[PDB]
């Protein structure tokens, strides 16, 4: 199995999982410790945002790749904004802060 691009889930925009659906492989928890254990930071940033979750960045990435520009704009993943609202849907005011 292999996936360039295709479906994304509705609640959070991460890719579907499967062969019965054209899914992307889970870069699961242990793999992230494995990247962190190299120095590899940019790989990780990509793997869990641009390749994955950032609804802007992935379409800007795709176009930069067809243009062959080899550059990314990383943003902030929409699954994390899901978390904020799911906490803020408790009476817990969580918020992003500036300084």
């Amino acid at each position: 199995h292999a996936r360039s691009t295709g479906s994304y889930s509705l609640v959070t925009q991460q890719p579907l999982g499967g062969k019965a659906q054209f899914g992307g492989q889970r870069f699961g928890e242990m793999e992230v410790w494995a990247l962190e254990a190299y120095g590899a930071a940019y790989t990780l940033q990509e793997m869990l945002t641009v390749k994955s979750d950032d609804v802007n960045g992935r379409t800007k990435m795709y176009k930069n790749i067809v243009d062959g520009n080899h550059q990314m704009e990383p943003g902030m993943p929409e699954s994390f904004n899901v978390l904020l609202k799911e906490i803020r849907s408790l009476g817990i005011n969580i918020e992003l802060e500036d300084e």
Binding site: E36, A41, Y42
Partner: peptide
Amino acid sequence: PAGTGYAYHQDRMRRR
């Protein structure tokens, strides 16, 4: 803030 990203956080924190 580790590895390559440490070196960036460091430059960001040094130009300070």
